């Protein structure tokens, strides 16, 4: 039984690969010669946010494009007014090993999680004036890698126990558990339409999921070792990736295969974060090299570098407005670029 | 006015300094070991679904935070990157166990990890009590798993505890030497292994951790001050 099923699965995999090869009548590099290269993109540190005691692990801009929450391994979430550097809040955490943080799209809540396997929801607007733990979403059997709000009531989270899940915050239950990954799930990106989301795992594969149906739709595998970061192209039909294999990859949902890979032979270190600019023309990735490289998403050539960090660049984000780019590092300083 | 916002920010920064003092005063420790190892008994006997546990204990006016990782996938390729730049890693093994080769492989993986290349390891050769009578009885032979023990004799620098049968000393020092060779092969001097013959009932575990942390900080400052 097992051998026959393996043969059938291999036949299906061969069919999928043949279909993808047939669809690859052209590659992005040939098409993108029709557009002018972006050229030299230079950004300067407009702000430097300090106050975190230890390594910064995560950060997330608010939809207002001004406030941004940040997390550090010392057990603090600090909300910054990036314009003025004012510390709007400072939330002490139950567990100091926080690996992710999110800002609710409405701006009312922030979430965080880490090696505690619990996604804590914090209410930034309560009549007592303090910041209160609204919910403690428990049920994952591994550390939390990423989380992103869908609504004030729904949040999707990745875990190191190979599962992503969708949570109903009010009831504190898992609406639907996503399974199929074989290794630790390291990051997830929520589509602009909010109906689909894609997560990369410690295996070579990044999988696309449908929250309404609660099941994987397709899988991508064009990576060598381990996917650390993932981001959705602004149009929502493509997503980037970052791996320990020291290269980015651009996939397309409709084509269902790799479109482009961004790497230079002199970059031999893993990628910790990935993000796109507002138009999607620039692909920004943070590396263990202590600096972030700006890639031309179409021409696939480096257009800049953000080297103003003293340690591993662990997180990276771009404002919904597209004005600025934030970055966090293990040196405990966030820096807004532009 | 936005001036009150700056006032709020400065109260926040005052609190951040206040807890920065506490953060810098405390020493963090990572606790590792297999389920056979009695690390749980060690932490429980620290007389001052969820993931990391925490134990707070103090020895001679200096406090420590020890982090025991609980419900997680068997792999630690990623979550051990968080525990970089801790003061020390405490590794606990069941000497009496045979899974000894599994413990050796685990210690190899921890020692050679690229994110823990500067973190000293406080190695607890735990459960000496069981090992002692396991060797004395003779119902099992360590040579079955490590035949090199048949042609091995206790070194000249060994210091057996007051009163000990030669065979138990030989066995315990053979295991300790296995771990020590593992440590030294890749050891470039940037981190050190501090082996200890420990049992969960021993009350010196806190003292041993404190002494090894004192030495680790001594060497860190010595390296900082260009003296090495």
């Amino acid at each position, epitope marked *: 039984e097992l051998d026959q099923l393996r043969q059938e699965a291999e036949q299906l995999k061969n069919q999928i690969r043949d279909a993808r090869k047939a669809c690859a009548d052209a590659t992005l590099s040939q098409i993108t010669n029709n557009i002018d290269p972006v050229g030299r993109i230079q950004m300067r540190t407009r702000r430097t946010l300090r106050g975190h005691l230890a390594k910064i692990y995560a950060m997330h801009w608010g939809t207002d494009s001004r406030l941004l929450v940040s997390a550090s391994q010392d057990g603090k979430l600090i909300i910054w*007014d990036s314009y003025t550097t004012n510390k*709007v809040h400072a939330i002490p955490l139950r567990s100091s090993w926080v690996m992710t943080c999110a800002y609710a799209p409405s*701006g009312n809540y922030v979430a965080c999680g880490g090696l505690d396997n619990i996604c804590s929801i914090y209410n930034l607007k309560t009549r007592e*004036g*303090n910041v209160r733990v609204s919910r403690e979403l428990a049920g994952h059997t591994g550390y939390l890698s990423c989380c992103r709000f869908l609504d004030d009531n729904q949040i999707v989270t990745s875990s190191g126990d190979t599962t992503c899940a969708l949570w109903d915050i009010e009831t504190g239950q898992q609406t639907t558990t996503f399974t199929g990954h074989t290794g630790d799930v390291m990051s997830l990106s929520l589509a602009p339409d909010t109906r689909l989301f894609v997560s990369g795992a410690c295996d070579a594969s990044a999988k696309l999921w449908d929250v309404r149906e609660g099941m994987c739709r397709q899988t991508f595998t064009g990576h060598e070792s381990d996917i650390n970061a993932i981001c959705f192209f602004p149009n929502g039909n493509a997503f980037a990736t970052g791996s320990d294999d020291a290269t980015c990859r651009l996939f397309d949902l409709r084509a269902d295969q790799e479109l482009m890979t961004y790497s230079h032979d002199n970059i031999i270190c893993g990628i910790t974060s990935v993000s796109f600019s507002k138009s999607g023309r620039l692909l920004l990735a943070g590396y263990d090299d202590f600096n972030c490289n700006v890639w031309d998403a179409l021409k696939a050539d480096r257009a800049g570098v953000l080297a103003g960090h003293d340690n591993r660049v662990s997180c990276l984000g771009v404002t919904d407005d597209g004005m600025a780019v934030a970055t966090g590092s293990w040196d405990s300083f966030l820096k807004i670029w532009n | 006015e936005d001036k*009150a916002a700056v*006032e*709020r920010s400065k*109260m926040i920064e005052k609190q951040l300094q206040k807890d920065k003092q506490v953060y810098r005063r405390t020493l963090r420790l990572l606790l590792l070991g297999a389920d056979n190892s009695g690390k749980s008994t060690i932490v429980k006997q620290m007389r001052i679904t969820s993931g990391i546990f925490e134990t707070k204990f103090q020895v001679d006016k200096v406090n420590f935070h020890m982090f025991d990782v609980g419900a997680q996938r068997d792999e630690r390729r990623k979550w051990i990157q968080c525990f970089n730049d801790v003061t020390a890693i405490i590794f606990v093994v069941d000497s009496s166990d045979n899974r000894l080769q599994e413990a050796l492989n685990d210690f190899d993986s921890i020692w050679n990890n690229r994110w823990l290349r500067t973190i000293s390891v406080i190695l607890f050769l735990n459960k000496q009590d069981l090992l002692a009578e396991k060797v004395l009885a003779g119902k099992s032979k360590i040579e079955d798993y490590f035949p090199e023990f048949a042609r091995y004799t206790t070194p000249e620098d060994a210091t057996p505890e007051p009163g000990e049968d030669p065979r138990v000393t030989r066995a315990k020092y053979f295991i300790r030497k296995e771990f020590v060779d593992i440590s030294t092969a890749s050891g470039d001097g940037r981190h050190i292994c501090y082996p200890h013959f420990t049992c969960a009932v021993d009350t010196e575990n806190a003292r041993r951790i404190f002494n090894d942390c004192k030495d680790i900080i001594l060497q860190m400052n010595l390296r900082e001050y260009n003296l090495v």
Partner: single-chain antibody
Amino acid sequence: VQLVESGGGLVQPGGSRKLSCSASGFAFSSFGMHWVRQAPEKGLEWVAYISSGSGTIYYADTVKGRFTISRDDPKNTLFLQMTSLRSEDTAMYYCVRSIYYYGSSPFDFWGQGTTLTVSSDIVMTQATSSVPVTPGESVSISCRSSKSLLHSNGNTYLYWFLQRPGQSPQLLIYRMSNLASGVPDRFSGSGSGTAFTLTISRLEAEDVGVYYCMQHLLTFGAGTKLEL
């Protein structure tokens, strides 16, 4: 959330008294504190301000030096000593909650207050003292300021208060564009920089009272009343 002021009564002009209020239901430490007096048959007048953490303290020139404000965070008690009193000082004093940060709503809560009876500043004006109206439709209330309240930061520091008969003033709109927490969709506001307008989309009998406009670039307007 509950603020109750204590003290008041009858005091001779040459006497002194200490007004005390107890804060309950919220973190009094993080909330800034303002004192607002409501003299008989006239509008509100700011008295003093103390920042959170006993930091910046301000007094109105009419009461500068004469009064001193004290804060006690651990007891959640606010104190205000009046060394000497004049006849004009008679007024009902409110305990106005306030916290300041990007997106906050200062002056959101007003305490019950106590009546104390005794035996350059920015000037603003309102279009009319009274405006007869009926429920089920909208009306417009406007006010003017001596100088543009639009600071270089890109926002106007003005607030609107509603004082129902026998009830403390309530914050309707802050910064001319943001509705308070809990206020219904019955209110809206707009302006150009020097003249602002408060528009009630649909009036109801439960909102009877007098409207005050205040700027925080603290002085209040003459007050506009709605006659149903």
